[PDB]
Structure formats: C-alpha cells, structure tokens
Symmetry: C4
Subunit: 90 residues, 4 copies
C-alpha cells in the first residue's frame, strides 16, 4: 500500500514536470511552473473540467495532447482507486 | 478480464462509429470524424460536461439523443468498473 | 438486486414527479414536464453541473431547493452504487 | 460505521466554520455564512466545479487556498467512501 503511494507521487511529479515543459509557454496559467502543473493534474485526476475546461483548449494548440492526458487519467484514476481500496481491505 | 477489455473496445468503437454518422454533420467539432467521436465518448464516459457541455446542445437538434447517450453511459460506466475490479481480484 | 432496481425506479419516478410540480413553472427547460425532469435528475445523479449548472440557479428562486436535491443525491448516488456492486458480487 | 458518520459531521462542521472565517468576506455568495459554507463544501466534496467554478477563483485572492481544499477533498472523498462501504459490509 505504501509502495503504491510512492509510485503515484513519482508518476505525479514526473507528469507535472512533462506538462510544465510541454504546455507551460502556451498555457502559463495552468502549466507555467511545477506548482501550477501539480495543481492542474490533481484537478485533471479528479476529472473536473478535464476535457471542456482544460484538454480541449490545450488540444487547440497541441493536437496530440490527448496522448498525454488520456493515459495520465487512466493510470492515476486507477492507482488512486487501488491505493484507497488497499487501506479499506487492511 | 481480457475478454472484458475486448468487449469495451468493440462497444467503444461501434458507439464512436454510430455517433460520427448521427451527429457528425450537425456537431462537427465533437463528432466530425471517428477520432473526435472516440475522444468525445471517452469524456462522456468520464461524465465530464456530458449533459450541459455535450448532450443538452445535441438534443436541441436531435431530441432523442438521450436514447443513445444515457444507455451508452449506463453500459460503459459499469463495464469500466467491472474491467478495473477484474484486475484487482486477479491479485487476491 | 432486482428489488433494489425496483426501489430506484419508484424513487426516480416519484422524485421526477415532485420536481415537475415544484420547479416546472420557474425552470421549464429543466423540469417543465416529467420527461425533462427524469432527464435532469439522471444528470443530477451523475453529479454533472448539479450545483453550478442546476441547483444554485434553482435556489436563487426556491432557497430551500437543497432539501430536495442534497438528500436525492445522497439516496440515489448510494442505491445506484449498491445495485451495481450487487451484480459484481453475484 | 456510526462513529464514521460522527467523524464526518465533526470534520464537515469545523471545515465549514474555517471556510466562513477564511473566505466569507472575499467570496460571500459561496462562504458568507455557515449555511452557504456547508452547501459549498458538500459540492466541493462531490467534486462539482471544485477547481474551475470554486477553488481557482478563490486562489486568485488567497494563493494558498489549495492547502485547505486539496486535503479537505482527500479526507472527505475517502471518509464518505469508507462510511458508505461500512453499511454495505453490515449486511454481509
Ligand atoms: C496529489 C498532490 C497534489 C499537490 C498540489 C499542490 C499544488 C500547489 C499549487 C500552487 O502552489 N500554486 C498554484 C497556482 O495556480 C502556486 C501558488 O499558489 C503559490 O506559488 C503561492 O502559494 C505563492 O507561492 C505565490 O503567491
Ligand atoms: C477508451 C478509448 C479512448 C480513445 C481516445 C482516442 C482519442 C483520439 C483523439 C484524436 O485523435 N483527435 C481528437 C481531435 O479532437 C484527432 C487527432 O488526430 C489530432 O491530432 C488532429 O487534430 C490531427 O489531425 C493533427 O492536427
Ligand atoms: C507520466 C504519465 C503520462 C505519460 C504520457 C506520455 C505521453 C507523451 C506525450 C508526447 O510525447 N507528446 C504529446 C504532445 O502534446 C508529443
Ligand atoms: C451503446 C449505444 C446504444 C445506442 C442505442 C440506440 C440508439 C439509436 C439512435 C437514436 O435514435 N438516437 C439518435
Ligand atoms: C434513470 C432513468 C433515466 C430516464 C431518462 C429519460 C429522459 C427522457 C428525456 C426526454 O424525453 N426529453 C427531455 C428534453 O430535455 C423530452 C424530449 O426529448 C422528447 O419529448 C422528444 O423525444 C420528443 O417527444 C419531442 O421532440
Ligand atoms: C454533508 C452535509 C450537507 C449539508 C448541506 C446543508 C446545506 C444548507 C444550505 C442553506 O441552508 N442555504 C444555502 C444558501 O446558498 C441557506 C438557506 O437557509 C436558504 O434557505 C436561505 O436563502 C434562507 O435565508 C431563505 O432565503
Ligand atoms: C424522493 C427523493 C427526494 C425527497 C426529498 C424531499 C424534500 C422535500 C422538499 C420540500 O418540501 N420543499 C423544497 C422546496 O424547494 C419545500
Ligand atoms: C479539513 C481542512 C484542512 C485545513 C488545513 C489547514 C488550512 C490552513 C488555512 C490556510 O492557510 N489556507 C488559506
Ligand atoms: Br476512466
Ligand atoms: Br449511472
Ligand atoms: Br455524496
Ligand atoms: Br482523490
């Protein structure tokens, strides 16, 4: 369970690094620094305005942004559900 | 578990085909090709702006669009829960 | 499991009747007939724009609308989760 | 299971008190009294417009508001899942 939380932190930090690099210049309010990026990716994980509010406006500049977000959603919104269920069984 | 993923892909591809045909001309930004349709239906599945952002604007042109989306939501937002639980059991 | 689905249909139909009566005149696009009401309450159940998009605009006319929606959400977004989990265990 | 519901009520009431104090003057429609605050925090819990609709506009005045909401979400959107699962087990 602890190793799952360690995996998620590593995946969340690396994805927030990638997004800062990728969309930081074009979308500075959402990904202009590591902080804004970790915040945005937590919101994207909770699925709040992920497509309409974030990903569709991004894809308008970077047409392949879905290659990042869709797997990011699928990975985190699974590992989070796995980590949370893990403590419930314990 | 693998058969569940195979079922979802088939259902997702066929639904994305149907939507492209149905709403592609009237709503081309959301369903104008298979790609835009698979993207939109993934978002509809995640329940993000499904009614306000997508389905209500669609229903304004096609009043019966709910016959497509509501069952699509009920089917996928169950099969996804079934597929994800399936791998979890494959550990215990 | 079947009795759970029968309970939800009864609760969903009665709540859609109540909403048509309560907010049908003031909010006719969302609750102007039984059909629009069953549609809106399915969306409210999925939690999509429930507060910002629906309930906050309603509460602006009917300040106690939260006495309807909040319990409706708590009841359905539990019974649905119970009904769906029921078949998974079977 | 009952102790879980008692824990959530205490956490929900104290969080609604904190928010009224913190953002009540700057954001009075959402946190201007305890009532508006308990309503907003129920919506924040359900994840409805939490960031775009509530937290991002708040952070524009209080840049650290995420220190309140993010843990609040993590705590409630876990304790609610724990409380709901608790009654389900009390049958099997
Ligand atoms: C799952 C792990 C989730 C971790 C989430 C951490 C989010 C951090 C958000 C954040 O810090 N910012 C987002 C901005 O949108 C930047 C500013 O809020 C911050 O820099 C200020 O506090 C001051 O330093 C400057 O005013
Ligand atoms: C559960 C399964 C989830 C499947 C998700 C698949 C999403 C595919 C989305 C997609 O391919 N596009 C979305 C468009 O909205 C179009 C892209 O091909 C885009 O790169 C185009 O713009 C190019 O022509 C280059 O400009
Ligand atoms: C780390 C989890 C998310 C990993 C996702 C990796 C996708 C790689 C994205 C990419 O290379 N381009 C997208 C350009 O937008 C180009
Ligand atoms: C899984 C899709 C399930 C689709 C169910 C049938 C849709 C029929 C198309 C229709 O009449 N509308 C527009
Ligand atoms: C969990 C159970 C969920 C059941 C959901 C059923 C929703 C039915 C929605 C509905 O029928 N309408 C919603 C309108 O917003 C009315 C119109 O769509 C309908 O009357 C048209 O099909 C034509 O008759 C007139 O053009
Ligand atoms: C998990 C626990 C969930 C608790 C949810 C409690 C919600 C309570 C919301 C509430 O009381 N109001 C929301 C306001 O946004 C104010 C009402 O008292 C309203 O009726 C007022 O307008 C009156 O003064 C009459 O006009
Ligand atoms: C059937 C499930 C939902 C049952 C909820 C019942 C609430 C009753 C609402 C009410 O009487 N007024 C709200 C006025 O807006 C007055
Ligand atoms: C459960 C709430 C958890 C709240 C955690 C502390 C919040 C401190 C208040 C703050 O600095 N911000 C604005
Ligand atoms: Br998903
Ligand atoms: Br559902
Ligand atoms: Br809830
Ligand atoms: Br979470």
């Amino acid at each position: 369970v602890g190793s799952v939380a360690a995996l998620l932190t590593v995946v969340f930090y690396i994805a927030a690094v990638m997004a800062t690099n990728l969309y930081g210049a074009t979308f500075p309010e959402w990904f202009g620094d590591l902080s804004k990026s970790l915040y945005t990716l937590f919101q994207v994980m909770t699925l709040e305005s992920w497509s309409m509010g974030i990903v569709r406006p991004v894809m308008n500049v970077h047409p392949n942004a879905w290659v990042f977000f869709i797997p990011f959603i699928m990975l985190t919104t699974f590992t989070v559900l796995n980590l949370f269920i893990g403590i419930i069984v314990d």
